[PDB]
Symmetry: D2
Subunit: 292 residues, 4 copies
Amino acid sequence: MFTGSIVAIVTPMDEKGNVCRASLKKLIDYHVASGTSAIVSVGTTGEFATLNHDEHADVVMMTLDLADGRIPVIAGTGANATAEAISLTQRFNDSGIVGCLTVTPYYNRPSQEGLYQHFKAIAEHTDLPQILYNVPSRTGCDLLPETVGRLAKVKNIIGIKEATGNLTRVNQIKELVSDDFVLLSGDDASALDFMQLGGHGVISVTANVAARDMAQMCKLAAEGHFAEARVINQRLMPLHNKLFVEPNPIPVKWACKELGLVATDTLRLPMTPITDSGRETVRAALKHAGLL
Amino acid sequence: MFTGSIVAIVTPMDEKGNVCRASLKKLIDYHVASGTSAIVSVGTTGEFATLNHDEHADVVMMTLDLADGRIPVIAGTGANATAEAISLTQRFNDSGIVGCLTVTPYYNRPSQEGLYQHFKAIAEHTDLPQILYNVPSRTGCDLLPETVGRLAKVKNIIGIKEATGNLTRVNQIKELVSDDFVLLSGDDASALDFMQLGGHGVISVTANVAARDMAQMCKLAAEGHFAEARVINQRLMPLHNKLFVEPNPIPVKWACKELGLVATDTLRLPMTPITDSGRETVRAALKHAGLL
Amino acid sequence: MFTGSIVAIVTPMDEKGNVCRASLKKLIDYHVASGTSAIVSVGTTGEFATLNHDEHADVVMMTLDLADGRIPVIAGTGANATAEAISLTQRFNDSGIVGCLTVTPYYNRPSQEGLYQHFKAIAEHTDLPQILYNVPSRTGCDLLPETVGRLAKVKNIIGIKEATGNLTRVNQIKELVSDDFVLLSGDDASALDFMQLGGHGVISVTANVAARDMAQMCKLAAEGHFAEARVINQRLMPLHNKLFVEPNPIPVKWACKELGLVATDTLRLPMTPITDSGRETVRAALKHAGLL
Amino acid sequence: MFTGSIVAIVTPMDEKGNVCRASLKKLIDYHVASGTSAIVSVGTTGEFATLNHDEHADVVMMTLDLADGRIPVIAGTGANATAEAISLTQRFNDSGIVGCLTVTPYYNRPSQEGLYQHFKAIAEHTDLPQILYNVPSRTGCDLLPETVGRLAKVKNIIGIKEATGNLTRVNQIKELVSDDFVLLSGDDASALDFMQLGGHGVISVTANVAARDMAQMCKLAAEGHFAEARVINQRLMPLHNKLFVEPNPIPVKWACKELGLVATDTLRLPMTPITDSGRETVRAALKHAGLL
Ligand SMILES: N[C@@H](CCCC[NH3+])C(=O)O
Ligand SMILES: N[C@@H](CCCC[NH3+])C(=O)O
Ligand SMILES: N[C@@H](CCCC[NH3+])C(=O)O
Ligand SMILES: N[C@@H](CCCC[NH3+])C(=O)O
Ligand SMILES: [K+]
Ligand SMILES: [K+]
Ligand SMILES: [K+]
Ligand SMILES: [K+]
Ligand SMILES: [K+]
Ligand SMILES: [K+]
């Protein structure tokens, strides 16, 4: 499933920074019960940067095992070296994942032609559906609509997670791609606006703690009931902002712990523990959303 | 050597994308002959993002072997996960390298407290001198002067490669650190200005192809001879700019090949070959510098 | 009328830079015939900066006289000194204009409290409806949604021309104001997106040369027929971009001359004549729109 | 005087918002006593946007009268319409002022060719020396070095007030102009850095309240005594920053009142009175500088 409310799931960790199977199970059951459309495993929110390849694969496989066919799983498979992205993708071929979420190379700042060759090569060597991921504030590069249009001609490049927050991208991309190419927001605070403009859903941090409200918001949006959706969005807006009051996923993991969905809020360095002021801001946002 | 003209040396490749030992040897001998102060091996210009750690370590160790004590070698040791940076640094402990160039974590956008903990942990696991490296355009993170002050208190944190191009940082940092903390430019086009303000040298892309000129410019700067240094700077200004006409190190590798310093200008995806328009721009800059 | 396609009309000039009544008459008749909703007289596009107060008033009065009740006229009344804005507003009280378009103070960078006091004072001393105008790229300040919400409580502050191009502003402002407060785009290239998000129309440069297509696009948008509207928008998109290929209103005045709507394309310094390359780009855009 | 510590003097007002002659006289005598090099009358800090031309001219002429040949007076003469800038400059022809400070047109965003024609036309209508003034954060326009080169060829264009805070501009401009073209900082917090790179002085907000310290710092800089100049700079750094805690000249007028240099801290809308939090910040900065 590549539409509606898709959660960019936290990778819950014990105090040692190793994946907590019991916490992950509780999250997955929560998403199944709450109507989340799909789970993005080891995306940005899942701390892909600080897992090594083996651990990253372990988490995807554990998520599939625990999901047990009840909810679709999309794996984070991005890398900043094209060989590495291919390699990681091969580990998931015939795993049971429904598709891959693949970020533009970060740090090295390739040209648009470099991005085209990068994604073309990755798509060539899998039959899995690929969702491109643009997040310039993290990567230092910006995958432009023209290049997205070029890549959407590749059979198994099927959509894009657009995380610029620049809403003009929706229709710039839509006019260059076929009607079946999926446009997903990667920016919770602008996601409803993104859907109103023609987007198909959101790959969401907020959904980690407000899964039912997110699922109902995205359904209302898909039906054209934007005023109704916007009531939900306004109750969620403090979370859409304050889940980034300190670096994601610091706030959302604390929030998941506060709700009892995970055993510990531990992250891996260079992510550090939430500050006291951050706890108080996040808690206020959870209360605004009616979750505590 | 942590002052003067420090080359961020290319990792020259064969057509297959693997390190070319003959080319690396030619470069290194060139830098010895030219008066380059030190070599940074597998920095940004050396394609650290697209080598695996073993490959990265092999290039560093080959560069150290070829230098044969003639010129000091600083290893690139940055990573966006602290555990991984520690692992890479530990490869070089007792190796012969003189210190480490360690970039702020990229993509994951840690807080300043996160940056402090990351670099502190790395410095704790080595006796080697650490040069911090700030380049927000690539990493999505900005290591601010206050945090650089805090880190300069750690015994073996000894300098910073400041690649913002924001020259106010020179004196902001200088006033927070001891007189022996080294300030190096990471931005060729502003590097003479950076030294004029108090900086100690440059870690340079341009030095790959104008090593003698860069070394002479930096020596004149260190002596307070700014007007003479500026004449050299003006002759190199088109390279300082046009070596970034396409993404670094695409132009500089081509320039190295054009000068006969390396056998091929091959890079790894997502870096792609220089365009025809790029070749003509870079050739014009080399001709301006009197190198061709 | 404060909805649909509203033209930010050029101030046509003879070769001496004085207002050309005959050219203005032809424009006004064109707008009446083509279904434009209203005319903004001496806005940005009408070169408010380079008319003195007497000339500025002359042009508004001439536009009202020529309109002869057939189309509503909104006067540009902005200034960067609150006394000056009041003064200019008084000149229009009981003139026949339907409202005023009042820009945030430029150059002096007031606080949000300063903007609130500025606009509150101007509104106090007129019974004319006021449309706030935010264009940070010109002014150096940004009138934020919170302050817009404060000002919308003032009885005769009735809407806002939002020219940031940042589409998140639509619903940030809408949630803070009453249902009858008018949201108008000031950014042609994002205007259709702006209306799709809940905006009520556009104060347009493009409408100067494509008045009928703009009027039909904004009606389709108001009816919810966005796919239909978007076909029109895509034929207009090169004009929405290339009317800013050189500083507005340089391109649009040339385009008006090329279509025969005005006798000369003359502007006042510091605006200068269109370049040859600009003529060719603008002409291509007019052809794309089917106007030549 | 177009070098050293040049004060962008406040236009002190009474409670009604009109120029206070006794306060202006106290300031001017202060600057004579302190060793200020020159006074810029009705620059940005002097509230040029909210005086009418007659008022503006009266303040300039009063400042010239009060200076009584003791200290040179440069008039602010900028406008965003060329005709208006010419008119204002012509007011001061044969007046006693030593030159003119003329800002790039604001709001209307002319091209570089437009800037060239604007300043050329103004210089043609006077024998007075012209200092260009670039401050893109306020004007929406950036007068680039290439254009500054082109204008420096006009006989009576003799310098530039560079208020970008982008220190690379010093040497970019210096290499395109003659050795006698003057480079002055418009940015107090980077001004010592600017002089260290080659600049000749500063047109300063801080000098309104730390005139002796600023004059001593600039003299030390001119002599090449940078380390001693930096000690003074560090003592003034909180003022350099906190005089912009609210919009200039709100903080500096309050500071002048607090020091007894002016009778009231009144400004004209849209500038508004300093907040209580602002007063406490500025008082802390004055105490740091040892002025209180
Ligand atoms: N820390 C490295 C490797 C991560 C590998 C597994 N996801 C990066 O962000 O590219
Ligand atoms: N491509 C990954 C791993 C590089 C590992 C060796 N230098 C990154 O940029 O972090
Ligand atoms: N040129 C000045 C005065 C214009 C007055 C009439 N609109 C400005 O842009 O504020
Ligand atoms: N407030 C108008 C006119 C100022 C005229 C005298 N200084 C402007 O900023 O251009
Ligand atoms: K395939
Ligand atoms: K496809
Ligand atoms: K140290
Ligand atoms: K009123
Ligand atoms: K109202
Ligand atoms: K000159």
